[PDB]
Amino acid sequence: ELASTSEFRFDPERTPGLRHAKNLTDESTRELERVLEENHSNHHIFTTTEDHKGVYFHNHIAHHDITIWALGANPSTIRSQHDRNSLYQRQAMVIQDSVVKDMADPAVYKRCLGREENFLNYCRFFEDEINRIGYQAVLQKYLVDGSEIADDMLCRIYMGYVHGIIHIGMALEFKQARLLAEGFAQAAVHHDWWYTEYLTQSEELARKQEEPALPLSDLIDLARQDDAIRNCSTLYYHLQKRKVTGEMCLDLEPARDGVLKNAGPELRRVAARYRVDPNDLERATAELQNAAVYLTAGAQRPPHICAFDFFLLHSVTSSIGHTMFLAEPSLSNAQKARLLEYTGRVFLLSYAGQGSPEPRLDWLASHPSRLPNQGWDEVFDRACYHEDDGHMCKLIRCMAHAEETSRPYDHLPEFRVKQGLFLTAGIAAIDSGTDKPMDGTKHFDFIRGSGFKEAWERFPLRT
Ligand SMILES: Cc1cc(O)c(C)c(C)c1O
Ligand SMILES: [Fe+3]
DSSP, X not given: OOBOTTOOOOOTTTSOOSSOOSSOOHHXXXXXXXXXXXXXXXXXXXXXXXXXXXXXXXXXXXXXXXXHHHTTOOHXXXXXXXXXXXXXXXXXXXXXXXXXXXXXXXXXXXXXXXXXXXXXXXXXHHHHHHHHHOHHHHHIIIIISOXXXXXXXXXXXXXXXXXXXXXXXXXXXXXXXXXXXXXHHHHHTOOOHHHHHHHHHHHHHHHTOOSOOOOHHHHHHHHHHOXXXXXXXXXXXXXXXXXXXXXXOOSSOIIIIIIHHHHHHHHHHHXXXXXXXXXXXXXXXXXXXXXXXXXXXXXXXXXXXXXXBTTTHHHHHHHTHHHHHHTOTTSOHHHHHHHHHHHHHHHHHHHHHTTOOOOOXXXXXXXXXSSSSOOHHHHHHHHHHOXXXXXXXXXXXXXXXXXXXXXXXXXXXXXXSOHHHHHHHHHHHHHHOOSOOEETTEEOSSBSOTTSGGGGGGSOBXX
């Protein structure tokens, strides 16, 4: 199954992922293995120091390179995209082999957590663990077996806007033990303590079963009806400037400083109702994936062009990984259910942070295609040439996957996004794209604070 911990090895037929272009070339695949190893060896998992912008910005190079290979990028496009995103990277941390070995003492493992200088140390520790006990046993030991170490790591994969679970999802999907170690290592060095508190306190509350279980889509809607949740945040988190230089920062963080400060008990009471049925996982997985497209693609405002929220779209891109968790024999139905629950509860926290935008699927559905005769194949190809850090192509590929996992359940009311709206949402995403989507690490094509009317002021009106 999983390629070597020591090397990246992709094949257009053996490792094409759950959703992809037609006719992936060996040439693109070799170029991809080249740039991935350059990225692993030369670039740190964070592209900023924490104090620079106030929160860590993440290295998306692994995710972008893989995604645009999967969508049929030529070797030249892979190189060009990778080279441009390489320019703002931090230099990789040093590996100390004595620390890698000492991390087998749980006291030492625990002492190294939350420290970015340990990123390649943890990568090697996880590569070693995979080779020692195999990946399936790593998932038990470091995620689902309910040890203090596995419960700690289960919260970390969601820290830093769920980049750990995104990385782990991609590793299982593309069958790379080397990317899986990267994933556990990314999670290990995060230190967003409020995720541990929210997910731990929410699981404890859910155990009491005080109110009935709802689909994620119903809980997105329930959050909006709540006075404390709908008012707990502000657009000000996306407009903060440093007093001295006027530079952008996230010194205040919507989740820590807004959602959990102002509406903690109210949100935990909603989160406690996302309880997933172990006997119904194919539908329950597809429903979480639909619900991510609902809250994200739904977050539109007439009379503006369709635009996608930078923070909400990590719900869609994180969501794909549960298709791999579902397909994994070594995980119990109960472990698979718990993973889904954690992901869903984070989706609610993220949604509240962005002002809980009321879905306007009517406005999304009437999106006028900039170009004629666009199907997924045409959208995928345009996503290859979109010059960001990979958010746009991951959003599009993950929505195309949700369309497929939803098709069997298109008649059920808890599936708010119906089959035709997925391609419309894909066209609306690529159509919102411009000729200069980024400047270094700054994004311009995504909205920030879609739930706040003022966020939409710099977005053109639909013609
Ligand atoms: C560009 C960019 C990358 C990131 O990973 C995160 C987390 C933020 C807030 C950003 O603005
Ligand atoms: Fe991201």
